[PDB]
């Protein structure tokens, strides 16, 4: 019960809570009728479930207590795709600085194990942002023509 | 806005807080040292997912307005086995329950519709209950030797 | 002679004598007629022999000197299987902390290339450990019978 | 900018200009008739190319300014084969010392993207050089039998 | 002495620029989220590599003196698309007539070799000039609307 | 606690030593750039070890009380590779020595089991001294021209 792993157990809230507003986020580009956006956050969702998980297994194999938690309530209304998209680029970069700062309270406490797991997850952020403002920019120049946000995606994601 | 409307969002969120029910059970049978009973329950959380999106799915295909919801907490601590698999059961009856009263609304209301979309969810519940009360009984036949509970599940389930 | 050098020296030394220790605890359970759990620790120190040689080609990659040592004594006699178990726990936790301090060191002199080189160890490490204490978990709920230990190691390991 | 954003374009130019140096070494080798060798080093000269687009592609993941830049003139004369392994072993030396600088200087802004992305760099910065060296001391074992350090390389390399 | 060997060694180092100003290019495209056109440019940066070494061949096979030379620094900044598909064009219609004055020196100065080994660089350009036109235009046509010359790109390039 | 038993277990902590002492040879040869011996010794060590093992069988087969020893110190300085041959062929020559007392011990303790348990070792030991002694010929014959005894091993071994 160092701060190592109780900020473990608060990335575990987290990623359950992203995974929950990439759902959110999918639900709402289905409503749009944008079938492209919406299986692209599905599928993120899913990846974001892995994480925690991938979490979870980590405080099992080190035999530190873990607690599968509740969700918080997330963002169900957007005035444009556009939002949603910023709204999860936000979230990514969000996620970024929290597994920043667990790597630097890993250091910090010499878990050398916890520092070199969270590795892996830094890697993978890189990419989830660069994606995520890809489409935030793409949905710019897109402007009111959802059709060729939803093209490029079909196409190149 | 209809009450079958209003049971059927509160219903995803039952099925979401369900699904991270199942999981929280999973990860005790997991540290528990008990794999077969964990595989089925991590399998048993993404079904109830499942559940949830056949419902969400359902709003959407009738314009009917759906919000992802945040989930409640969570029960982690088990003194045994069998405790978790009580909680299972009695979840299971619960939302039995829940899916029963649905149908009643949509009777009720003359909500032809979601009446009949409610049916499948019926037969789902037999099994699934049928299923969660066996684990029951097997658990407390074999008492504390859960490696019997273990074998039956790795043969029969 | 550098400290980080003259450590992985010794960790050479080490994980040759951890290799084995293992063929030692191998043989008891061969010994044994536990032939499920022999077979596991018969691999177990190939593996221990490999991590030696990944860090004698460490050495040779960087035309550091590298000595192939002796090996210390290693313990044969145990009471009972639990015992010899016990010992591979043990012998894998300290194992994990002679890496961490390798990690420190190397981190300590600016040696850059062997503190990445570690990074890999402790992931295994990490997998290593969770597995043993699983198998010293499961022995202590087998107590006397072993057939049931022996059963869950020729299914689940 | 950032130290470690300015140290990254530098990297990328010095990545281009070590690629431009590999091709001079290898057209120096193909000039002598000794395929081998040229053949290598061609291939060494993509490889490098490929680690400058690498430094490249992490800057446009992470949206900071990239310039792909002009290259330094490189050394085309050579005395003997042996000179431009020399030459090669040498740069490798000096780009792993950069790798190195980047790391710390990560290290010390608390860049961890950076200092996580420079850790693939430092494994293959070690098989690099472990080769280079070699190529020199089979060079020098060879003397002027060159045909000896071309058998060699077909085997071996 | 000769100058027809001397414009070839000048003409190594205009394709070894010409490339690097293609890399610039592509990366340009790449990072205003362009992929098809990207795609191309970091294609073209290895076909005009390629150029760079036929002629490098061409010197090498007749025992002239080749240098590897240094790439003087390229174009980066690009107001919009059409401007860095205006340099390229430029580019090519610029490669062209060097290599036509070439063409004219090797006549000149009766080496048959060289005229005769710039005739396949005459086809390369005729097409290549006529993409690079094609996509100019291609881009006045589509103006702000990038979206239909990515398209275009894909289905016709 | 019977001669030939407790010759066997000596033999056992010969072998594991034996096996030691190629590594150490392989590691020489792998730091002197001479692959082709280096690849061979690391597998003479596998096979050293599977000697050793086969003894530990035939104690367990017996229920003949079988420690797993440690491994006295090896030598890892040669002044050349004839040097570490030379050792080698020594090494297996001893080997022979102690298996044909192994022998002698059984027969005059009327151990028919374990006379006959050693006749294979007898066999691999004429076929393994026979090549180590070609090596050792070979050697002298290259002299300093270590090229041609690696060229004769990737061959003929």
Same mark, same amino acid.
């Given at each position: 019960?160092?701060?190592?792993?109780?900020?473990?157990?608060?990335?575990?809230?987290?990623?359950?809570?992203?995974?929950?507003?990439?759902?959110?986020?999918?639900?709402?580009?289905?409503?749009?009728?944008? %079938?492209?956006?919406?299986?692209?956050?599905?599928?993120?969702?899913?990846?974001?479930?892995?994480?925690?998980?991938?979490?979870?297994?980590?405080?099992?194999?080190?035999?530190?207590?873990?607690?599968? %938690?509740?969700?918080?309530?997330?963002?169900?209304?957007?005035?444009? %795709?556009?939002?949603?998209?910023?709204?999860?680029?936000?979230?990514?970069?969000?996620?970024?600085?929290?597994?920043?700062?667990?790597?630097?309270?890993?250091?910090?406490?010499?878990?050398?194990?916890?520092?070199?797991?969270?590795?892996?997850?830094?890697?993978?952020?890189?990419?989830?942002?660069?994606?995520?403002?890809?489409?935030?920019?793409?949905?710019?120049?897109?402007?009111?023509?959802?059709?060729?946000?939803?093209?490029?995606?079909?196409?190149?994601?």
């Amino acid at each position: 019960k160092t701060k190592f792993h109780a900020l473990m157990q608060e990335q575990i809230h987290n990623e359950f809570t992203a995974a929950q507003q990439y759902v959110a986020i999918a639900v709402y580009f289905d409503s749009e009728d944008l %079938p492209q956006l919406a299986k692209h956050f599905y599928s993120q969702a899913v990846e974001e479930r892995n994480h925690a998980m991938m979490l979870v297994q980590h405080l099992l194999d080190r035999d530190l207590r873990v607690e599968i %938690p509740g969700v918080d309530t997330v963002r169900n209304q957007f005035d444009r %795709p556009r939002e949603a998209l910023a709204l999860a680029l936000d979230q990514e970069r969000t996620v970024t600085d929290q597994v920043g700062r667990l790597t630097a309270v890993a250091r910090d406490e010499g878990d050398f194990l916890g520092e070199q797991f969270m590795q892996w997850f830094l890697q993978e952020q890189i990419e989830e942002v660069a994606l995520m403002a890809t489409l935030v920019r793409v949905a710019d120049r897109a402007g009111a023509n959802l059709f060729e946000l939803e093209n490029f995606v079909a196409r190149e994601v």
